[PDB]
Amino acid sequence: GEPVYADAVLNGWLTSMGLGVEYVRAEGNTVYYLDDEGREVPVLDHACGFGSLIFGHNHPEIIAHAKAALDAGTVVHAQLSRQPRANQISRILNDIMRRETGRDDRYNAIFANSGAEANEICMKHAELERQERITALFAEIDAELDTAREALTTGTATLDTASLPLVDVDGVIADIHRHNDERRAERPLFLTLDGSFHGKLVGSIQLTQNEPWRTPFTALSSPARFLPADEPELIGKIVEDERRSVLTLSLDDTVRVVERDFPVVAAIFVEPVRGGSGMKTVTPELAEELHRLRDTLGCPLVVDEVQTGIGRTGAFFGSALLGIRGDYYTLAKAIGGGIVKNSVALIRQDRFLPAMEVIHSSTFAKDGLSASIALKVLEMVEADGGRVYQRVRERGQRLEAMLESVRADHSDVVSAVWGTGLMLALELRDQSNATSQAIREKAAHGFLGYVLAGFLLREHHIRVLPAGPRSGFLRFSPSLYITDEEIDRTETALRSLFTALRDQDGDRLVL
Amino acid sequence: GEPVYADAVLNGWLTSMGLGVEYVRAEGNTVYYLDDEGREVPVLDHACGFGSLIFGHNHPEIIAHAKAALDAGTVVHAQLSRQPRANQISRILNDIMRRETGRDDRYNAIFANSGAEANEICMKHAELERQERITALFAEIDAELDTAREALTTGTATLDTASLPLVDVDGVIADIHRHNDERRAERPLFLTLDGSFHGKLVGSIQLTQNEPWRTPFTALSSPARFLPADEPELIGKIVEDERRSVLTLSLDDTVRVVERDFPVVAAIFVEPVRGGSGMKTVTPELAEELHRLRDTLGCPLVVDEVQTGIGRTGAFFGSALLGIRGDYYTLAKAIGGGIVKNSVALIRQDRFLPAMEVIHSSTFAKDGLSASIALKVLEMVEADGGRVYQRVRERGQRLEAMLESVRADHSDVVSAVWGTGLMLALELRDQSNATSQAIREKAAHGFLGYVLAGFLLREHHIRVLPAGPRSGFLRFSPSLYITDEEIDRTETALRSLFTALRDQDGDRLVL
Ligand SMILES: Cc1ncc(COP(=O)(O)O)c(/C=N/[C@@H](C)C(=O)O)c1O
Numbered sequence A, B: 001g002e003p004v005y006a007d008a009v010l011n012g013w014l015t016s017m018g019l020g021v022e023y024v025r026a027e028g029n030t031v032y033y034l035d036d037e038g039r040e041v042p043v044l045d046h047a048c049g050f051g052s053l054i055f056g057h058n059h060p061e062i063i064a065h066a067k068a069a070l071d072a073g074t075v076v077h078a079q080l081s082r083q084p085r086a087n088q089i090s091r092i093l094n095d096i097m098r099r100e101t102g103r104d105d106r107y108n109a110i111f112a113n114s115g116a117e118a119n120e121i122c123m124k125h126a127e128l129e130r131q132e133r134i135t136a137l138f139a140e141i142d143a144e145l146d147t148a149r150e151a152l153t154t155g156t157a158t159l160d161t162a163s164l165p166l167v168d169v170d171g172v173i174a175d176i177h178r179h180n181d182e183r184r185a186e187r188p189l190f191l192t193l194d195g196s197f198h199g200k201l202v203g204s205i206q207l208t209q210n211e212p213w214r215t216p217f218t219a220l221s222s223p224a225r226f227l228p229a230d231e232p233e234l235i236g237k238i239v240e241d242e243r244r245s246v247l248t249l250s251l252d253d254t255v256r257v258v259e260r261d262f263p264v265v266a267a268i269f270v271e272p273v274r275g276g277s278g279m280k281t282v283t284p285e286l287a288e289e290l291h292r293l294r295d296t297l298g299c300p301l302v303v304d305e306v307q308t309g310i311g312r313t314g315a316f317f318g319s320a321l322l323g324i325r326g327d328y329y330t331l332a333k334a335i336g337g338g339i340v341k342n343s344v345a346l347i348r349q350d351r352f353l354p355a356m357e358v359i360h361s362s363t364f365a366k367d368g369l370s371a372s373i374a375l376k377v378l379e380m381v382e383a384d385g386g387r388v389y390q391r392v393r394e395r396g397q398r399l400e401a402m403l404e405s406v407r408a409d410h411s412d413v414v415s416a417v418w419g420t421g422l423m424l425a426l427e428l429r430d431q432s433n434a435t436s437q438a439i440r441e442k443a444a445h446g447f448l449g450y451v452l453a454g455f456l457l458r459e460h461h462i463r464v465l466p467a468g469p470r471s472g473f474l475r476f477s478p479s480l481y482i483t484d485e486e487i488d489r490t491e492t493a494l495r496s497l498f499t500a501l502r503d504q505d506g507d508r509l510v511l
C-alpha cells in the first residue's frame, strides 16, 4: 500500500497472469530480464512490439543511422519550412506500390505519430470527400427546386399529390429544406470488418470491435458497422439498411417529391490480415465484396497496413499480396525502425483534396529524426533486389510449418493456424468447459491466452502475447532474423504447453 | 510540372509567404539553411517547435543521453511487461506539482505519442466518469419508477395529470424509458474557451476553435461550446442553455412526472496560456469561472499544458503559476527533449477509474527510449535547486521588455504584448484597410503574419511563425539560452519590420 503513480492495476494483472517481468535490454529477437542473482536471462520475443520489429530490437544499422542523424544536428522541429524528406519517402512508397500492384497510381502522403493518427487522417480526409459530395448534391437539389418552382408558379406543370406523403409550393419546399438540413448534420457511418482493430483514440476506437475497449466511448464519435467477414452474403443487406434519402422536386407536365441517395458512409476500413480477429487474411471473396461496396457507395476504401506493411506478409503491402485495391493506405509500426514513432496516410492523388495539406497538421508529425529513420527502414527492406521479402516468406513458411506440425499433434487444444509471412497465430479451442477449475475460471474471464503466455515465459523463456477478443489466439510475429534453433525451442515450448493443457494441469499453468 | 508525392500545396504557399526555405542543421537557438553558394546561413529560431525546444535544438546533454540509451539496448518495445520508468516519471511530476501548488494530491499517468493523444485520453476518461454518473442516475430513476408504480397500483397515491405534458401508469413509464434512452445515447458536450487549441484528431479538432481547421469535421465527433474568455458574465447563460433533463416519477398522496438533471458536459478544457488566442494568459476572474463550472457540473477540468508545461512560463506548471486547479493535466512538447515524441495525461487518483489502465493502450506509448529521455529532461529542468525556472523568468522578462519597448514606439501597427515567461507574442493591428494593395490583399486572406515572418527571414535571418486565427499575432517562444545579443538582433529586426509596415512598403514586404 505504498504510493503508486502509474501502472498499479496493469502490473497487478500482469503479475497474476505470470507476465510480471521487467526487460532491461533487447537485441535482435531477444529481451533480457534480471534473475534473483542479477544475471541477464535471455527470452525469445515473438510479440516484437505487436509486429513493429521486422528487423528486431535495436538493429545495429538502425541504431547507427539514428546516432548519425543526431550527430549531424538533424532539424527535428522545422514546422512550416520545406522538408523534402516527406516527398522522398512518399516517392519510394509510390514506386513500391506500383511495382507490387502493377497499378500506375500516385499517392499523396500525410505523416503522423501513431497508427491511430494515420487512420484518423484518413477518416478526416474521407469526411472532406463526403462534404464535397454533399455540397454538389445540395447544389443540384437547389437547381431541381428552382426548376420545379418556375414550372409550378408559371403553370407549365402541376404538383402530383400522391408523392406528398414524403413531406402549397413554398411550404412543400421549406419542408424539403428542413428534412434535408436534418439529414445533412447527422453523423456519418464507417464500415469495418468484425474483429477490426484500427486504434483507440476518440475517432478510431469506434472503428475497433473489442467491446470492453469501445462500448464505454460509443456516445463520443461516429460509429462503425462491423460487417461479417465470414458471412459476406449478409454485408449487402446490412449496408442497404443504412441507405438514407434526401428530398427534391422532379420535373417531367407533372412535378413529384422524390427521394435521392444521401452519402452516409465516410469510408470502408480493412486490415489485409485481421489483428483483432487472430491474424485471419482477407479472402478473395471478401476483397471483392469490399470493392463492390467502395464502387457502389463512392466512399474510399482505407487499407490499414499499420501491422501488415513494411514486409511483414512477405510483400511490402499485404493489400498487394491479397488483391485489396484501396483508395487510402496507412503505415506505422516497423517504419520507426523499432526506436522512433512515425506513421503515414497515402491518399490517391485523383481523390486528394489539397485543403488537407494546410488544414491538417501536428507538432511532431514529419519530424527530421523519424523522417531520416523511415528512409533507412525503406532502404533496408528494399535492399538487394527485394531479397528481404524472400527472407520474410521463407522464415514465415518455416514458422507456419512448425505451427501446423504442432496443431496436427495437439488438435484437441489448437483449432487453426492463421496469417501469412511472419504475421501468424494459433487459435486455442474454448476452455470454458475445462476439468481444472483454475483453467476454466481464467478461460471464462477471457484470460486463457495470457495464462498460457505466462507458462511459456517462466518454463521456456519465450515471450508470446495473445490476440483476439477473449485472448483466444497466441500471436507469433518475430523478426526476419528468427533462427531454425529459436523455432525448434518454440516448438518444444508449445508441445510442453499443449501437453499440460491436454492434461488440465491447472497447478502448473495458473499461479 | 514534375510528379510530386507530398507537400506541393504547402510548399507553394510557404514559397509565396517568403518562408520557402529548407533548414539542414540546427543547434541551440539556430537553424541553418543553404544560400545560393551552398554556405550555411544561421537563422535565429523564435518558433522552436511551437515551444517544444525550451533547451534548444539538439541540446548536447539530450543527444548524449539518447546516444547512451540506444548503445545500452534500451527496450523500446516491451508492451504488457513491467516498465517502472512510467511510475518514476509520474512520481516526479507528482512531487513537482505538490511543490508548486502546495496541494498534496496524487495523479495517475497514462502516456501517449502527441499532445492531441494526451488530450483524447482525458476526453475518454471524462466520458468514463460520465457513464459512471449516468449508470447511477438511471439506477435511481428505476427505483423512483418502482416506488411510484407500487404507490399507484396499490392505490396509496394518484397520478397528477397536470405533469403529463412532459410525456395510464405502464404507458407513461414506457414513454419515460423511451425519452431517457434517447437522451442517454446523445453525444456529450465539451466546454473550451474561444480561440482554444487542443489538437487536430477526430475528437480533439472539435475542441479547436480555428474555423477552417474544424468546421469540415463537425459531423464526426462531440462538439465543444467555446466560452467567451473576456466576457465571462455570459458563460453562465451559455452552459445553462445546454442543461438537458431526463424524466422520472416523484412520490409525495400524489405522483408527478418531473425532470431531473442529465450529465451532458464530459469535460472543461483550458490552456493556462492560450496558444490559439495569441498567447493570452487565463485571468484570475476566468480561472474562477472555470472552477465554478467544474464544481457545478461535476465534470473534470482538463488543463492542457502541452505548450505551457516543462518550465515555459517560468514554473514547471503554468496552471500552478496562474492558480488553475485542474482535475486532469496534459504534457507533451518539451518532454521529448526536442528529438523524440512523448505525452502524458495526469488524472487525479480520487477520480481515476482503474479500467482505463487496461482498456486504453497504444503501440508506441510508454516506449523505453522516450521514457529515458523524459527522465533526463525532468532531471535538467529540476537541476541546481530550480535555477532553470529562474533563468526562464529572467530571459522571459528581458524578451518581454524588448517586445514592450518595440510596441511603445510602433503602437500604430502593434496592439499588445501577450503571454508570460518565454511564451510571448505581439498582436498586429488589422491591416485589411492598408494603403498598399499587396499588404491589404494578404491581410484580407488571413496571411499578414506569414508575410511579415517572410520579411524577418530574408532581411534579418530570424525565424518567427504567426499565431491566432488570421495570423494576427507573431509568436516568440525561444530556448532559455536566448542571448542578450539575439534579443537585440530581434529588436533591430522588428523596428525595421514595423517601420516598413508603417510606410506601407508592400514591394519590400510582399514578393
Ligand atoms: C492494424 C492496426 N491499426 C491501427 C493500430 C493503432 O496503431 P497505434 O495507434 O497503436 O500506433 C494498430 C495497433 N495494433 C496493435 C496494438 C495490436 O493489435 O496489438 C494495428 O495493429
Ligand SMILES: Cc1ncc(COP(=O)(O)O)c(/C=N/[C@@H](C)C(=O)O)c1O
Pocket (backbone or CB within 6 Å): A361, A362, A363, A364, B050, B114, B115, B116, B117, B119, B197, B198, B199, B200, B271, B275, B276, B304, B305, B306, B307, B308, B332, B333
Ligand atoms: C496547447 C496545445 N494542446 C494540444 C496541442 C496538440 O499537440 P500535438 O498533437 O500537435 O502534438 C498543441 C500543439 N500546439 C501548437 C501546434 C500550436 O499552438 O501552434 C498545443 O499547443
